[PDB]
């Protein structure tokens, strides 16, 4: 067995409030623990969406009562809320901008609206953007015009990682995350998945996109699942929403890659622990660790045990490595397929004294 | 009468070679002279497209034999020609990038291809981009990464002009052009035009887009027609190509605006003479001038006399101001509805000693 620190997934969709047949805080954080994850950051594209103080207050209580691991909640940018989030901004994981079409009603239709958010959101707090292809260059321009940093979530294309690489070479403050489906799946998999299951944003890339991401691993700051649960009925239906569940498969896939020498254990810990902490200013978790077994070989089944999504695009993949035990803040939280902490054990890390983002005092 | 210097239209499509039922050098430059224009820069989206030395050589001869006014020819960026244009680059007006869907096969599908052109095209030579909405921010980012300037053609939206305004305020080297249809037409006109005639890229904007362009006139560097002739049969057909003819209506519309006090005569001369010269390094034309009459009131007819397009989206608009006489290099070129210089009178200004772009000698 190997002992790892508590891993952090900075990009999950837990569907509560409003989509709880797909997942809720209790089921989604159970999936997190089973995947060796002890802290999650939940996206705001719920129903109602987390785009104002009252929606945030509601989500916070739902999470505090339902979460089994620790968490922070993102606020979402809308066409109406720029300049209105200053009072609650510090209590959120960060601000999420949806800049392309995806499972969300929050798309901003004008770059001027992006600028307004970059100008009004506190400068010391994280901004994350769903930005695909040329949109990555556009949001980078807005970040430069407003003189601040931006984080690009789920980078999926050779085009995108090479653009980010060029920006870092010029010293621009940009960081990025890559999700496991964009490292381990490609167009070649759509035959097997079909057009419904295969729907995700950004879409699965070519083999060349996948190869470019591996070749440019040094450019990738974080891994995150983009856990996006939808039921099989929805994925197989007439208007399939995009997204894959992934909390329970992420670490097993990456541990397999480690065992094959495609990256080191440190590469993994930088991207699932240290970089998430430092980019999102997330606090340490006392007495918290994950024990993995690197020798157990298994095949991913048609669905993982915990997520309500009840399906997985990785069905049939051979992996080596499994999560054996998770201890969270001194309590056994997970052992071999059984979660052992109840809904509500998890806490909002932004309310911990060490979880606040340091800022310069009033002028 | 008022005497103006020779006006320059930096963005015309003359359709030769390959689309000569829509327009050719002879008919298109006749339309230019009638519109008070003595020098045009022709775009490369012809058939074959001007994307290599042999296509350029062909277009140059066709222009030299057919043009009635002076001209320069753009090269077009393709997915294959980056790094191959150095030998002929200096003979072109500049390099044109097509970054969105429009009447062209030259769209570049990856921002990496944009970067390659910005890195390989000589740094002292003009680059123009068809870039809409967020694409404006994206190409600006590529210009910054490669540390050079870019010119944005046909700006049509409040979103775009405000982005450019913000970039100029930060001292970024960007310039832009606005076409008359985006100052004088809007959504409100689509009722009258219909869905076929009304097809253009960028599409007609809202009244708010139009108002934003007028309010931000100080941000606009050039006016150009984006003369994009297609026959009525094509515009009224099942797959209408986008674009308006505009060489013969541009100056009359702008002179009307001058007479109404919406801008000054100087505002007009900066944008149709001085700024085109300095951004594209176009040479002066000896013994060349345009005489306009600011008092004659008339209504734009169903088609203007010269363009083969044989239709106009400005039909029915009341204008005040008309071109009475054009002298080009010491010859009467146009009087009151009659062109008096033959096809081939016009010359390639990039072959004039004063028409070369100054550059630092070899290292
Ligand atoms: N990526 C997806 O395909 N879906 C995500 C939304 C998102 O991350 O854009 C979801 O919330 O379902
Ligand atoms: N603007 C248009 O609607 N059409 C132009 C092309 C262009 O300028 O994009 C054309 O060549 O027809
Ligand atoms: Zn997303
Ligand atoms: Zn997401
Ligand atoms: Zn264009
Ligand atoms: Zn054009």
PDB file of N, CA, C and O in Angstrom, chain A residues 291-352:
ATOM      1  N   UNK A 291      -5.154   5.593   1.236  1.00  0.00           N
ATOM      2  CA  UNK A 291      -4.275   4.448   1.013  1.00  0.00           C
ATOM      3  C   UNK A 291      -4.686   3.733  -0.258  1.00  0.00           C
ATOM      4  O   UNK A 291      -5.830   3.297  -0.390  1.00  0.00           O
ATOM      5  N   UNK A 292      -3.762   3.634  -1.208  1.00  0.00           N
ATOM      6  CA  UNK A 292      -4.056   2.953  -2.459  1.00  0.00           C
ATOM      7  C   UNK A 292      -3.219   1.692  -2.575  1.00  0.00           C
ATOM      8  O   UNK A 292      -2.165   1.562  -1.937  1.00  0.00           O
ATOM      9  N   UNK A 293      -3.722   0.764  -3.381  1.00  0.00           N
ATOM     10  CA  UNK A 293      -3.063  -0.499  -3.675  1.00  0.00           C
ATOM     11  C   UNK A 293      -2.721  -0.455  -5.162  1.00  0.00           C
ATOM     12  O   UNK A 293      -3.614  -0.318  -6.003  1.00  0.00           O
ATOM     13  N   UNK A 294      -1.435  -0.546  -5.493  1.00  0.00           N
ATOM     14  CA  UNK A 294      -0.984  -0.352  -6.873  1.00  0.00           C
ATOM     15  C   UNK A 294      -0.908  -1.643  -7.683  1.00  0.00           C
ATOM     16  O   UNK A 294      -0.575  -1.623  -8.874  1.00  0.00           O
ATOM     17  N   UNK A 295      -1.236  -2.762  -7.047  1.00  0.00           N
ATOM     18  CA  UNK A 295      -1.031  -4.069  -7.666  1.00  0.00           C
ATOM     19  C   UNK A 295      -2.315  -4.728  -8.177  1.00  0.00           C
ATOM     20  O   UNK A 295      -2.271  -5.546  -9.094  1.00  0.00           O
ATOM     21  N   UNK A 296      -3.451  -4.373  -7.585  1.00  0.00           N
ATOM     22  CA  UNK A 296      -4.724  -5.007  -7.939  1.00  0.00           C
ATOM     23  C   UNK A 296      -5.179  -4.633  -9.349  1.00  0.00           C
ATOM     24  O   UNK A 296      -5.408  -3.459  -9.642  1.00  0.00           O
ATOM     25  N   UNK A 297      -5.311  -5.635 -10.215  1.00  0.00           N
ATOM     26  CA  UNK A 297      -5.771  -5.426 -11.584  1.00  0.00           C
ATOM     27  C   UNK A 297      -7.260  -5.729 -11.686  1.00  0.00           C
ATOM     28  O   UNK A 297      -7.729  -6.739 -11.170  1.00  0.00           O
ATOM     29  N   UNK A 298      -8.010  -4.851 -12.341  1.00  0.00           N
ATOM     30  CA  UNK A 298      -9.452  -5.054 -12.472  1.00  0.00           C
ATOM     31  C   UNK A 298      -9.972  -4.397 -13.737  1.00  0.00           C
ATOM     32  O   UNK A 298      -9.243  -3.644 -14.400  1.00  0.00           O
ATOM     33  N   UNK A 299     -11.213  -4.716 -14.093  1.00  0.00           N
ATOM     34  CA  UNK A 299     -11.840  -4.177 -15.298  1.00  0.00           C
ATOM     35  C   UNK A 299     -13.004  -3.285 -14.876  1.00  0.00           C
ATOM     36  O   UNK A 299     -13.807  -3.668 -14.022  1.00  0.00           O
ATOM     37  N   UNK A 300     -13.084  -2.078 -15.430  1.00  0.00           N
ATOM     38  CA  UNK A 300     -14.155  -1.166 -15.048  1.00  0.00           C
ATOM     39  C   UNK A 300     -15.505  -1.734 -15.482  1.00  0.00           C
ATOM     40  O   UNK A 300     -15.688  -2.102 -16.644  1.00  0.00           O
ATOM     41  N   UNK A 301     -16.458  -1.828 -14.528  1.00  0.00           N
ATOM     42  CA  UNK A 301     -17.773  -2.442 -14.785  1.00  0.00           C
ATOM     43  C   UNK A 301     -18.724  -1.490 -15.501  1.00  0.00           C
ATOM     44  O   UNK A 301     -18.316  -0.370 -15.825  1.00  0.00           O
ATOM     45  N   UNK A 302     -19.964  -1.919 -15.745  1.00  0.00           N
ATOM     46  CA  UNK A 302     -20.895  -1.104 -16.529  1.00  0.00           C
ATOM     47  C   UNK A 302     -21.358   0.134 -15.749  1.00  0.00           C
ATOM     48  O   UNK A 302     -21.768   1.141 -16.342  1.00  0.00           O
ATOM     49  N   UNK A 303     -21.288   0.058 -14.424  1.00  0.00           N
ATOM     50  CA  UNK A 303     -21.495   1.234 -13.583  1.00  0.00           C
ATOM     51  C   UNK A 303     -20.693   1.108 -12.294  1.00  0.00           C
ATOM     52  O   UNK A 303     -20.515   0.001 -11.775  1.00  0.00           O
ATOM     53  N   UNK A 304     -20.200   2.236 -11.780  1.00  0.00           N
ATOM     54  CA  UNK A 304     -19.537   2.235 -10.479  1.00  0.00           C
ATOM     55  C   UNK A 304     -20.565   2.254  -9.358  1.00  0.00           C
ATOM     56  O   UNK A 304     -21.711   2.673  -9.548  1.00  0.00           O
ATOM     57  N   UNK A 305     -20.156   1.802  -8.171  1.00  0.00           N
ATOM     58  CA  UNK A 305     -21.076   1.597  -7.047  1.00  0.00           C
ATOM     59  C   UNK A 305     -21.814   2.844  -6.539  1.00  0.00           C
ATOM     60  O   UNK A 305     -22.960   2.709  -6.107  1.00  0.00           O
ATOM     61  N   UNK A 306     -21.202   4.026  -6.563  1.00  0.00           N
ATOM     62  CA  UNK A 306     -21.802   5.147  -5.825  1.00  0.00           C
ATOM     63  C   UNK A 306     -22.574   6.220  -6.610  1.00  0.00           C
ATOM     64  O   UNK A 306     -23.633   6.675  -6.168  1.00  0.00           O
ATOM     65  N   UNK A 307     -22.047   6.654  -7.749  1.00  0.00           N
ATOM     66  CA  UNK A 307     -22.717   7.727  -8.482  1.00  0.00           C
ATOM     67  C   UNK A 307     -24.102   7.291  -8.947  1.00  0.00           C
ATOM     68  O   UNK A 307     -24.265   6.179  -9.464  1.00  0.00           O
ATOM     69  N   UNK A 308     -25.103   8.151  -8.754  1.00  0.00           N
ATOM     70  CA  UNK A 308     -26.445   7.863  -9.273  1.00  0.00           C
ATOM     71  C   UNK A 308     -26.491   7.828 -10.792  1.00  0.00           C
ATOM     72  O   UNK A 308     -27.495   7.411 -11.368  1.00  0.00           O
ATOM     73  N   UNK A 309     -25.433   8.282 -11.461  1.00  0.00           N
ATOM     74  CA  UNK A 309     -25.455   8.273 -12.925  1.00  0.00           C
ATOM     75  C   UNK A 309     -25.702   6.847 -13.404  1.00  0.00           C
ATOM     76  O   UNK A 309     -26.362   6.610 -14.428  1.00  0.00           O
ATOM     77  N   UNK A 310     -25.138   5.897 -12.672  1.00  0.00           N
ATOM     78  CA  UNK A 310     -25.360   4.483 -12.952  1.00  0.00           C
ATOM     79  C   UNK A 310     -24.906   4.056 -14.350  1.00  0.00           C
ATOM     80  O   UNK A 310     -25.547   3.206 -14.972  1.00  0.00           O
ATOM     81  N   UNK A 311     -23.810   4.644 -14.841  1.00  0.00           N
ATOM     82  CA  UNK A 311     -23.178   4.219 -16.091  1.00  0.00           C
ATOM     83  C   UNK A 311     -21.773   4.816 -16.100  1.00  0.00           C
ATOM     84  O   UNK A 311     -21.473   5.670 -15.269  1.00  0.00           O
ATOM     85  N   UNK A 312     -20.919   4.379 -17.022  1.00  0.00           N
ATOM     86  CA  UNK A 312     -19.592   4.994 -17.166  1.00  0.00           C
ATOM     87  C   UNK A 312     -19.015   4.773 -18.561  1.00  0.00           C
ATOM     88  O   UNK A 312     -19.110   3.676 -19.117  1.00  0.00           O
ATOM     89  N   UNK A 313     -18.414   5.823 -19.142  1.00  0.00           N
ATOM     90  CA  UNK A 313     -17.822   5.691 -20.477  1.00  0.00           C
ATOM     91  C   UNK A 313     -16.553   4.828 -20.476  1.00  0.00           C
ATOM     92  O   UNK A 313     -16.036   4.491 -21.553  1.00  0.00           O
ATOM     93  N   UNK A 314     -16.055   4.484 -19.291  1.00  0.00           N
ATOM     94  CA  UNK A 314     -14.825   3.702 -19.190  1.00  0.00           C
ATOM     95  C   UNK A 314     -15.096   2.209 -19.040  1.00  0.00           C
ATOM     96  O   UNK A 314     -14.166   1.420 -18.842  1.00  0.00           O
ATOM     97  N   UNK A 315     -16.365   1.816 -19.140  1.00  0.00           N
ATOM     98  CA  UNK A 315     -16.721   0.401 -19.055  1.00  0.00           C
ATOM     99  C   UNK A 315     -15.801  -0.426 -19.946  1.00  0.00           C
ATOM    100  O   UNK A 315     -15.604  -0.097 -21.121  1.00  0.00           O
ATOM    101  N   UNK A 316     -15.224  -1.483 -19.380  1.00  0.00           N
ATOM    102  CA  UNK A 316     -14.396  -2.396 -20.147  1.00  0.00           C
ATOM    103  C   UNK A 316     -12.908  -2.079 -20.140  1.00  0.00           C
ATOM    104  O   UNK A 316     -12.102  -2.866 -20.638  1.00  0.00           O
ATOM    105  N   UNK A 317     -12.525  -0.929 -19.594  1.00  0.00           N
ATOM    106  CA  UNK A 317     -11.104  -0.595 -19.558  1.00  0.00           C
ATOM    107  C   UNK A 317     -10.412  -1.353 -18.432  1.00  0.00           C
ATOM    108  O   UNK A 317     -10.964  -1.505 -17.341  1.00  0.00           O
ATOM    109  N   UNK A 318      -9.208  -1.850 -18.708  1.00  0.00           N
ATOM    110  CA  UNK A 318      -8.426  -2.555 -17.700  1.00  0.00           C
ATOM    111  C   UNK A 318      -7.616  -1.528 -16.929  1.00  0.00           C
ATOM    112  O   UNK A 318      -6.914  -0.708 -17.528  1.00  0.00           O
ATOM    113  N   UNK A 319      -7.704  -1.572 -15.606  1.00  0.00           N
ATOM    114  CA  UNK A 319      -6.930  -0.664 -14.776  1.00  0.00           C
ATOM    115  C   UNK A 319      -6.132  -1.438 -13.741  1.00  0.00           C
ATOM    116  O   UNK A 319      -6.445  -2.589 -13.429  1.00  0.00           O
ATOM    117  N   UNK A 320      -5.094  -0.801 -13.217  1.00  0.00           N
ATOM    118  CA  UNK A 320      -4.299  -1.394 -12.148  1.00  0.00           C
ATOM    119  C   UNK A 320      -4.113  -0.337 -11.081  1.00  0.00           C
ATOM    120  O   UNK A 320      -3.557   0.727 -11.353  1.00  0.00           O
ATOM    121  N   UNK A 321      -4.596  -0.616  -9.876  1.00  0.00           N
ATOM    122  CA  UNK A 321      -4.617   0.381  -8.817  1.00  0.00           C
ATOM    123  C   UNK A 321      -6.029   0.629  -8.318  1.00  0.00           C
ATOM    124  O   UNK A 321      -6.967   0.789  -9.113  1.00  0.00           O
ATOM    125  N   UNK A 322      -6.185   0.671  -7.001  1.00  0.00           N
ATOM    126  CA  UNK A 322      -7.499   0.860  -6.411  1.00  0.00           C
ATOM    127  C   UNK A 322      -7.386   1.584  -5.079  1.00  0.00           C
ATOM    128  O   UNK A 322      -6.349   1.521  -4.407  1.00  0.00           O
ATOM    129  N   UNK A 323      -8.445   2.288  -4.702  1.00  0.00           N
ATOM    130  CA  UNK A 323      -8.475   2.961  -3.409  1.00  0.00           C
ATOM    131  C   UNK A 323      -8.885   1.950  -2.339  1.00  0.00           C
ATOM    132  O   UNK A 323      -9.932   1.307  -2.468  1.00  0.00           O
ATOM    133  N   UNK A 324      -8.072   1.799  -1.291  1.00  0.00           N
ATOM    134  CA  UNK A 324      -8.365   0.801  -0.248  1.00  0.00           C
ATOM    135  C   UNK A 324      -9.001   1.425   0.990  1.00  0.00           C
ATOM    136  O   UNK A 324      -9.905   0.841   1.597  1.00  0.00           O
ATOM    137  N   UNK A 325      -8.532   2.612   1.364  1.00  0.00           N
ATOM    138  CA  UNK A 325      -9.000   3.260   2.581  1.00  0.00           C
ATOM    139  C   UNK A 325      -8.795   4.771   2.535  1.00  0.00           C
ATOM    140  O   UNK A 325      -7.773   5.259   2.048  1.00  0.00           O
ATOM    141  N   UNK A 326      -9.774   5.507   3.043  1.00  0.00           N
ATOM    142  CA  UNK A 326      -9.663   6.945   3.145  1.00  0.00           C
ATOM    143  C   UNK A 326      -9.941   7.327   4.579  1.00  0.00           C
ATOM    144  O   UNK A 326     -10.939   6.891   5.157  1.00  0.00           O
ATOM    145  N   UNK A 327      -9.050   8.131   5.154  1.00  0.00           N
ATOM    146  CA  UNK A 327      -9.291   8.730   6.458  1.00  0.00           C
ATOM    147  C   UNK A 327      -9.477  10.230   6.284  1.00  0.00           C
ATOM    148  O   UNK A 327      -8.635  10.901   5.683  1.00  0.00           O
ATOM    149  N   UNK A 328     -10.592  10.756   6.786  1.00  0.00           N
ATOM    150  CA  UNK A 328     -10.869  12.184   6.659  1.00  0.00           C
ATOM    151  C   UNK A 328     -11.015  12.798   8.033  1.00  0.00           C
ATOM    152  O   UNK A 328     -11.933  12.445   8.781  1.00  0.00           O
ATOM    153  N   UNK A 329     -10.103  13.712   8.356  1.00  0.00           N
ATOM    154  CA  UNK A 329     -10.096  14.414   9.635  1.00  0.00           C
ATOM    155  C   UNK A 329     -10.235  13.444  10.805  1.00  0.00           C
ATOM    156  O   UNK A 329     -10.993  13.689  11.756  1.00  0.00           O
ATOM    157  N   UNK A 330      -9.497  12.337  10.719  1.00  0.00           N
ATOM    158  CA  UNK A 330      -9.352  11.424  11.842  1.00  0.00           C
ATOM    159  C   UNK A 330     -10.381  10.317  11.899  1.00  0.00           C
ATOM    160  O   UNK A 330     -10.369   9.494  12.819  1.00  0.00           O
ATOM    161  N   UNK A 331     -11.279  10.294  10.917  1.00  0.00           N
ATOM    162  CA  UNK A 331     -12.300   9.259  10.856  1.00  0.00           C
ATOM    163  C   UNK A 331     -12.125   8.426   9.605  1.00  0.00           C
ATOM    164  O   UNK A 331     -11.797   8.948   8.534  1.00  0.00           O
ATOM    165  N   UNK A 332     -12.334   7.122   9.734  1.00  0.00           N
ATOM    166  CA  UNK A 332     -12.362   6.265   8.565  1.00  0.00           C
ATOM    167  C   UNK A 332     -13.596   6.633   7.755  1.00  0.00           C
ATOM    168  O   UNK A 332     -14.726   6.549   8.247  1.00  0.00           O
ATOM    169  N   UNK A 333     -13.374   7.048   6.514  1.00  0.00           N
ATOM    170  CA  UNK A 333     -14.456   7.526   5.659  1.00  0.00           C
ATOM    171  C   UNK A 333     -14.833   6.499   4.593  1.00  0.00           C
ATOM    172  O   UNK A 333     -15.972   6.462   4.113  1.00  0.00           O
ATOM    173  N   UNK A 334     -13.870   5.666   4.219  1.00  0.00           N
ATOM    174  CA  UNK A 334     -14.087   4.687   3.166  1.00  0.00           C
ATOM    175  C   UNK A 334     -13.154   3.493   3.330  1.00  0.00           C
ATOM    176  O   UNK A 334     -11.958   3.659   3.597  1.00  0.00           O
ATOM    177  N   UNK A 335     -13.712   2.291   3.184  1.00  0.00           N
ATOM    178  CA  UNK A 335     -12.914   1.072   3.079  1.00  0.00           C
ATOM    179  C   UNK A 335     -13.506   0.127   2.054  1.00  0.00           C
ATOM    180  O   UNK A 335     -14.670  -0.268   2.164  1.00  0.00           O
ATOM    181  N   UNK A 336     -12.698  -0.258   1.077  1.00  0.00           N
ATOM    182  CA  UNK A 336     -13.043  -1.351   0.167  1.00  0.00           C
ATOM    183  C   UNK A 336     -14.508  -1.430  -0.221  1.00  0.00           C
ATOM    184  O   UNK A 336     -15.138  -2.471  -0.047  1.00  0.00           O
ATOM    185  N   UNK A 337     -15.052  -0.338  -0.742  1.00  0.00           N
ATOM    186  CA  UNK A 337     -16.383  -0.378  -1.317  1.00  0.00           C
ATOM    187  C   UNK A 337     -17.476   0.031  -0.354  1.00  0.00           C
ATOM    188  O   UNK A 337     -18.657  -0.010  -0.703  1.00  0.00           O
ATOM    189  N   UNK A 338     -17.093   0.421   0.857  1.00  0.00           N
ATOM    190  CA  UNK A 338     -18.067   0.873   1.845  1.00  0.00           C
ATOM    191  C   UNK A 338     -17.731   2.272   2.354  1.00  0.00           C
ATOM    192  O   UNK A 338     -16.640   2.512   2.864  1.00  0.00           O
ATOM    193  N   UNK A 339     -18.673   3.201   2.233  1.00  0.00           N
ATOM    194  CA  UNK A 339     -18.471   4.526   2.815  1.00  0.00           C
ATOM    195  C   UNK A 339     -18.945   4.522   4.267  1.00  0.00           C
ATOM    196  O   UNK A 339     -20.009   3.979   4.580  1.00  0.00           O
ATOM    197  N   UNK A 340     -18.149   5.109   5.158  1.00  0.00           N
ATOM    198  CA  UNK A 340     -18.367   4.944   6.595  1.00  0.00           C
ATOM    199  C   UNK A 340     -18.539   6.256   7.345  1.00  0.00           C
ATOM    200  O   UNK A 340     -18.558   6.276   8.577  1.00  0.00           O
ATOM    201  N   UNK A 341     -18.637   7.360   6.608  1.00  0.00           N
ATOM    202  CA  UNK A 341     -19.054   8.624   7.208  1.00  0.00           C
ATOM    203  C   UNK A 341     -20.404   9.014   6.605  1.00  0.00           C
ATOM    204  O   UNK A 341     -20.651   8.790   5.422  1.00  0.00           O
ATOM    205  N   UNK A 342     -21.289   9.584   7.433  1.00  0.00           N
ATOM    206  CA  UNK A 342     -22.664   9.887   7.031  1.00  0.00           C
ATOM    207  C   UNK A 342     -22.778  11.216   6.296  1.00  0.00           C
ATOM    208  O   UNK A 342     -21.878  12.063   6.380  1.00  0.00           O
ATOM    209  N   UNK A 343     -23.890  11.401   5.577  1.00  0.00           N
ATOM    210  CA  UNK A 343     -24.168  12.685   4.932  1.00  0.00           C
ATOM    211  C   UNK A 343     -24.085  13.774   5.976  1.00  0.00           C
ATOM    212  O   UNK A 343     -24.640  13.597   7.067  1.00  0.00           O
ATOM    213  N   UNK A 344     -23.392  14.869   5.672  1.00  0.00           N
ATOM    214  CA  UNK A 344     -23.280  15.957   6.624  1.00  0.00           C
ATOM    215  C   UNK A 344     -21.959  15.977   7.385  1.00  0.00           C
ATOM    216  O   UNK A 344     -21.660  16.950   8.079  1.00  0.00           O
ATOM    217  N   UNK A 345     -21.166  14.916   7.264  1.00  0.00           N
ATOM    218  CA  UNK A 345     -19.846  14.899   7.897  1.00  0.00           C
ATOM    219  C   UNK A 345     -18.941  15.970   7.279  1.00  0.00           C
ATOM    220  O   UNK A 345     -18.084  16.566   7.956  1.00  0.00           O
ATOM    221  N   UNK A 346     -19.145  16.223   5.990  1.00  0.00           N
ATOM    222  CA  UNK A 346     -18.300  17.163   5.266  1.00  0.00           C
ATOM    223  C   UNK A 346     -18.570  18.605   5.631  1.00  0.00           C
ATOM    224  O   UNK A 346     -19.685  18.962   6.022  1.00  0.00           O
ATOM    225  N   UNK A 347     -17.548  19.448   5.498  1.00  0.00           N
ATOM    226  CA  UNK A 347     -17.659  20.847   5.898  1.00  0.00           C
ATOM    227  C   UNK A 347     -17.240  21.789   4.779  1.00  0.00           C
ATOM    228  O   UNK A 347     -16.483  21.411   3.884  1.00  0.00           O
ATOM    229  N   UNK A 348     -17.732  23.023   4.852  1.00  0.00           N
ATOM    230  CA  UNK A 348     -17.409  24.065   3.878  1.00  0.00           C
ATOM    231  C   UNK A 348     -16.030  24.624   4.243  1.00  0.00           C
ATOM    232  O   UNK A 348     -15.867  25.271   5.292  1.00  0.00           O
ATOM    233  N   UNK A 349     -15.021  24.354   3.416  1.00  0.00           N
ATOM    234  CA  UNK A 349     -13.652  24.721   3.796  1.00  0.00           C
ATOM    235  C   UNK A 349     -13.434  26.223   3.812  1.00  0.00           C
ATOM    236  O   UNK A 349     -12.503  26.703   4.456  1.00  0.00           O
ATOM    237  N   UNK A 350     -14.287  26.968   3.112  1.00  0.00           N
ATOM    238  CA  UNK A 350     -14.156  28.427   3.094  1.00  0.00           C
ATOM    239  C   UNK A 350     -14.561  29.062   4.422  1.00  0.00           C
ATOM    240  O   UNK A 350     -14.314  30.248   4.659  1.00  0.00           O
ATOM    241  N   UNK A 351     -15.178  28.278   5.297  1.00  0.00           N
ATOM    242  CA  UNK A 351     -15.516  28.791   6.626  1.00  0.00           C
ATOM    243  C   UNK A 351     -14.444  28.462   7.673  1.00  0.00           C
ATOM    244  O   UNK A 351     -14.516  28.931   8.804  1.00  0.00           O
ATOM    245  N   UNK A 352     -13.448  27.665   7.299  1.00  0.00           N
ATOM    246  CA  UNK A 352     -12.312  27.425   8.185  1.00  0.00           C
ATOM    247  C   UNK A 352     -11.427  28.670   8.197  1.00  0.00           C
ATOM    248  O   UNK A 352     -11.234  29.312   7.162  1.00  0.00           O
TER     249      UNK A 352
END
